[PDB]
Amino acid sequence: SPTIPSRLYSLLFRRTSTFALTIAVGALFFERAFDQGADAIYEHINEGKLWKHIKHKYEN
Amino acid sequence: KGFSYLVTATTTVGVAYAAKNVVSQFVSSMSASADVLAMSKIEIKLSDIPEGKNMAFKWRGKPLFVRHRTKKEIDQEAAVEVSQLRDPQHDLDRVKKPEWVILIGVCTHLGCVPIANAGDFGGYYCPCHGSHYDASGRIRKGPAPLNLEVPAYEFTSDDVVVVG
Amino acid sequence: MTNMRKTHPLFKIINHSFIDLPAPSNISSWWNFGSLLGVCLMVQIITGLFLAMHYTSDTMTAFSSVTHICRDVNYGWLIRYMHANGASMFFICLFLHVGRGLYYGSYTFMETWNIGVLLLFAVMATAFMGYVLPWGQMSFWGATVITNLLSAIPYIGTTLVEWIWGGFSVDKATLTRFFAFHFILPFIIAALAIVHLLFLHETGSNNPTGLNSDADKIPFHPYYTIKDILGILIMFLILMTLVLFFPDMLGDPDNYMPANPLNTPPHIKPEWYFLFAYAILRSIPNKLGGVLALILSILILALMPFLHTSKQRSLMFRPITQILYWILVANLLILTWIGGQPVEHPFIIIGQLASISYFSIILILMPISGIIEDKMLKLY
Amino acid sequence: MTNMRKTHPLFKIINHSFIDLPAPSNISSWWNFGSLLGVCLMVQIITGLFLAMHYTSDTMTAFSSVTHICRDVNYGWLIRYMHANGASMFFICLFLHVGRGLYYGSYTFMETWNIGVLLLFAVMATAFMGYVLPWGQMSFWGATVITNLLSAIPYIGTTLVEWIWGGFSVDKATLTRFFAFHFILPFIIAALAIVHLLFLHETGSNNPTGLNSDADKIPFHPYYTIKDILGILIMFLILMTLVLFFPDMLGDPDNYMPANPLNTPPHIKPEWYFLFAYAILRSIPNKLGGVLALILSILILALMPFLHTSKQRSLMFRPITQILYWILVANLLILTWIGGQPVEHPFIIIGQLASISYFSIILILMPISGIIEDKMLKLY
Amino acid sequence: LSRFLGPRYRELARNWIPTAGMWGTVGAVGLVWATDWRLILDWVPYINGKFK
Amino acid sequence: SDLELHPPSYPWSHRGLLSSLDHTSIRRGFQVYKQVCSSCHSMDYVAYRHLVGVCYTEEEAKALAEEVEVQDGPNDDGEMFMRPGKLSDYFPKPYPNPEAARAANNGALPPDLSYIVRARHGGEDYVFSLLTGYCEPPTGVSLREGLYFNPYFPGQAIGMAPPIYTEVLEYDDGTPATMSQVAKDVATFLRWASEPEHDHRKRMGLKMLLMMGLLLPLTYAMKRHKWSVLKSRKLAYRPP
Amino acid sequence: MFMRPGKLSDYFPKPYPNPEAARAANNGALPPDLSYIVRARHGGEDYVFSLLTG
Amino acid sequence: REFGNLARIRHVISYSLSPFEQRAFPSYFSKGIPNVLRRTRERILRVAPPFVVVYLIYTWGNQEFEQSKRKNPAMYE
Ligand SMILES: CCCCCCCCCCCCCCCCCC(=O)OC[C@H](COP(=O)(O)OCCN)OC(=O)CCCCCCCCCCCCCCCCC
Ligand code: HEC
Ligand code: HEM
Ligand code: HEM
Ligand code: HEM
Ligand code: HEM
Ligand code: FES
Fold this sequence. Notes:
By secondary structure, chain A is an all-alpha fold. Chain A has two helices and no strands. Chain E has one domain (1-52). Chain E has three helices and no strands. The termini of chain E are far apart. The site of one protoporphyrin IX containing FE has 25 residues of chain C, from helix 3, helix 5, helix 6 and helix 9. Chain F: Belongs to the cytochrome c family.
């Protein structure tokens, strides 16, 4: 069983075009993942204080 | 090599993400501000428009002509065919309210504002390159490529019109 | 002891670029216009620095500040008219620079020519926003016209014009950002001019004969220093006779009114150096076609070095292309006059024929005529 | 086939300057501050370009324009605080640059050092006028105080002050002209930085040992490329942790009030580098003497290349002069604190002792320490 | 013109087709990631969540 | 006198580096400003469009915009006239010029309460201490009419009547309207008015901290990787 | 606001406070500011003379 | 590129005089007017006729515009 860094180098990290392709795909997916995680950390820290936390008693 | 290039790939993903965000910060900073988005909704036109007259106001930052139309003007607009102009359009499909017509006064050749109450068709006469327009803004005699845009308005109670 | 002029680093750079530069001994007065352009840039930098020293960029106070410069500031009217006529004569010398480039075969310097094309785009954009700056009637309406011209692009154009506007029309944000852009862009022009001169010094300078000037050269000092000084003084005679005797034949009277969005001028034109591009875009009856016509017409300058199908460099031994080149200059004058006049009969068909002849000459007729002259002189 | 990097002229210049530059392999983290200064200069240029894209210089609308930037412009608060904290970071890296030169004997490169001193003066003027620009209480009153400092000069002081003011007070002409000067002067800083880098590139960089670095020399790429990338990242960390958590710890509270000419603040404090200059100003109790003290306190950096009497270039191997140098940094800090504090007991006598100790320790004591070290090393 | 019309240049071009296509794919995904292109980013399942 | 009293460091709910503002307290302080502090002080830079998305909903902010009246015009005769305000308008000024404020408030000009937290030393701590620190003057000093003693105000004599007390206004959420609660609410609302970018800025800072704590080890790893050629390099001198 | 005899630094007083009241009082047409009418009309002083005497 | 060497020249002799010993305007008119007239003869037929066509169709365009301004009597009844 090949190691996963060896598999990563053989499939994606060898050719520079595939390197840039996986860089961009990882950029998109990682931007989504950290946007979700960072906002979730923020509202968990600031639960009960934000406007969307207190919003539900004023629309309806 | 996979471990080293994995470190390089993750840090250049982080750098590209940060660069994308800061360039978007700059581009959104050069975009429209909160105040000019706030005055993107025009004020109330009320019922100060005279009979058969037009008024030019600042709606969405641009010149908007709100003009009162008569029964003869409505009959002429109905008698004007749809496909007889440069583009297929009708006055009934253009303006819901036949008494008052609200349009964005920007011509379709160089983006000038036409002079109201002028022209041989009874509408407007934009003199930058000589385009005449009817009561609905249809191009009959002129070099304008398209027709005059009609803004998407809303009508509250009879003294209140919300245009934006 | 040592030679300070060629051993001190800044001094040896200045000596190797401007003092002991091997220049062709036979270049005519048409070669002065590069230094004329540089001194134009310096003069406009200084005069505009004084204008922005006494100028405020706000739609309520732009015209008020212009009036304050004209009347209250000591010689502020002189600085303002010096800036305006300097921009106009800067475009005159730009057109003569470009004409020298097409005539004497200077487009064989590929990188220098491309840097010049980028400089031309930069200076037209810079002077466009400078004409936007005083917030006149025709100024504001020309700003709207050129922004809609950029908005002619499909699916990108409306977002791009709302981004350039900073809103939905030319307003305070547009005027302030245009003030910032007009301030910054001449320094980018200066940096690109440094790149221009670096490429030119790498590739050497051209002579009117289009031949190898390496057999007979003279140092740039004192010959071309005193020659370009004579050019600078003739420059200043023309510039100040425009400033002090006839200040308003190059400007527009409609620029001397406050910018009224409600009122539209009956005859709208850009300033005289945009007139040929405005004429060809008015000739082509399509927004997308017109804007592509304008951009490609300026880009024929950069596309031109690939059209050199003659074994003779300059036109100075090529009389058929001399006739075609002067027809091209005549057609440019026709396009300027057509952009000046409005849209009636027969200005539409005259401008259409002028644009068609312009494109057909500069793409088709010059290379075919060059092939004809090669067969005439029996090159093959 | 040829090497484009070593053949194309722009690429040749970039290769000989930033890519294949022979750099010493042992330069410490203190040598990243030149690249940090360049990066902060680019950041300041871009950020101020956006600020002036959204900024109008007029006494009625300057504070309203800054407030509109901070409130209604999308991320204009980030732009404005980035500009202010980037100016602070620029001065931090600039003082560390100067301290690196002082401690490692880089002032023996006399032309590069003098160009750096001119750069330091230009950065002082730029930051002073930029702090005048938001039209706060501190802006107006610091402008009046420093202009009266200029007025301390005999027989021409009043005339030059009324010329600089554009009138008889800090007013609309002063604000607009300071906007023009503050926008334009960083481009002169960039040109002088190009001259700075050229004068350095003549002779190569310096090592912390102060020895000849030609023994062990490495290319600038990729070693110092990635080292400067890491330094840029750390500088961005400190800069935007200031911006996003403590944006006002280096600013002033009452600067956020509109500038009232009739009302006066209880205390006068510019930024901390000008607090150093202000303490040196007010140590000596006469106007012309204090002005000459401030000017001389900046020109002693240029004077110090003539004050190097030791036979060893760097302070790496001279421990007494290290003690003197850190005493110098100590009363830099003390003078900054005194300039922060108001002028009462005991801050008056502490500032006087600090200033006289500063001038003595730079003028007369370091050459004595160097000659004592040479005597102790049997070099004399 | 006729300089780049031959079997050697054709086989060089055919060797460089996958690399040029990969670089075009990189440019396309970088363009849509930088500009946040809705018409392409309303199809990938995860990134669909943030637009809502 | 020449002395000044430094206000203490109150433990605010937004004192932490990643702690946002309490928007219920912000809207309560907005009510406190509206029927308490708007009679004298002005806010030239905070608008109902800023109130949307932080304090109230769009409809509620709009409704409190028509509850005031705004000068506008010109009409067809070229005259100014009253119109109901909307979300685009700013907060209404109590006086047209500062000289009217000087005439009405006995020569004392109330400064703009739009940058007062960023303008006073201490900020919301200063505002809270100034509002809660009203007390009788010590024996010996005397103040004329319209002047009141305050330890935190520089000069110790402020021209301000005690603005808030217990049950000065009625809240909407049923919070007890004691004087300390009213002072805390108006202090945090003034903090939001002086810095509307607080919560967004702190979210930006948290994102920046996480990405730089990820990027510094990785960039340091690249630097040590590229420099490992030199840092493990070995030298030898072999003279004849 | 009060009344005051104007000194040298004051400009010429406007006959109308805002241009729309001028439009109302002058039967629709707005009298333009004649501080740049010569530089703002094609002909200048010739146009002004011909307009007044024509 | 540098002034020391640019090209190979053999057997070429150049004679030059001092500017303070020769005149600055030697026969400026008598040998100057025939020279500029000869240059005009050489390059007058390739430059002037295009601008003649410019002037001709300039006048033609002005005349057609003014004629379009002028009405016609096709409206008698
Ligand atoms: C003679 C000391 C002997 C010490 C022996 C220690 C053990 C040695 C054997 C074991 C080795 C231990 C490690 C050695 C490290 C390097 C050597 C070292 O530290 O030497 C001591 C050091 C340098 O000694 P040296 O420079 O010869 O001292 C001359 C006195 N000026 O000198 C020092 O550290 C002393 C520094 C004293 C500085 C006093 C400064 C007072 C004034 C500060 C004013 C600052 C400004 C204030 C404001 C002024 C205006 C108001
Ligand atoms: C009319 C009686 C007012 C009421 C109601 C409020 N304020 Fe007051 N403010 C008023 C005056 C006349 C002054 C100036 C008085 C002086 O001596 O200068 C002020 C000033 C302030 C200040 C600034 C204090 C400083 O040290 O600069 C603050 C912080 C302040 N006012 C706060 C404040 C708040 C939060 C209020 C609502 C509860 C409020 N004031 C009401 C007049 C009046
Ligand atoms: C906008 C500012 C410009 C500046 C400051 C500038 C500067 C100069 C200077 C000083 C010269 C040397 C003088 C000479 O050789 O005649 C020169 C020559 C040249 N310029 Fe420009 N130029 C500018 C624009 C342009 C443009 C718009 C073009 C072409 C479209 C161009 C193309 C050239 C070429 C090809 C040469 C070489 C001519 C020769 O060697 O004979 N430049 N330029
Ligand atoms: C550092 C350089 C420059 C600065 C600071 C500057 C500044 C200004 C300012 C403040 C104005 C407004 C004053 C007015 O409109 O009369 C202006 C106008 C103008 N500028 Fe510049 N300018 C600079 C360079 C240039 C250049 C390089 C050009 C042309 C390529 C140019 C062309 C113009 C034009 C045409 C106007 C319009 C003037 C008018 O129509 O009356 N400027 N400039
Ligand atoms: C104000 C903007 C400045 C910029 C943009 C700048 C730029 C630079 C750069 C990029 C370097 C190369 C990096 C390095 O050698 O560490 C450098 C080095 C140097 N700078 Fe500066 N500098 C500035 C100010 C100064 C000042 C204020 C001084 C001295 C008072 C100075 C004196 C020097 C010296 C002597 C060196 C040579 C360092 C060595 O030999 O190792 N520069 N500068
Ligand atoms: C091309 C370069 C620059 C431009 C266009 C520019 C422009 C501006 C503008 C428009 C402002 C007022 C906006 C505001 O304060 O809210 C400003 C403020 C300021 N600028 Fe610059 N600037 C430039 C470079 C610099 C540099 C190089 C420095 C310092 C070394 C600097 C230091 C400052 C400071 C300290 C302020 C005041 C910030 C505050 O009061 O909090 N600027 N600048
Ligand atoms: S822009 Fe309306 S007729 Fe041309």
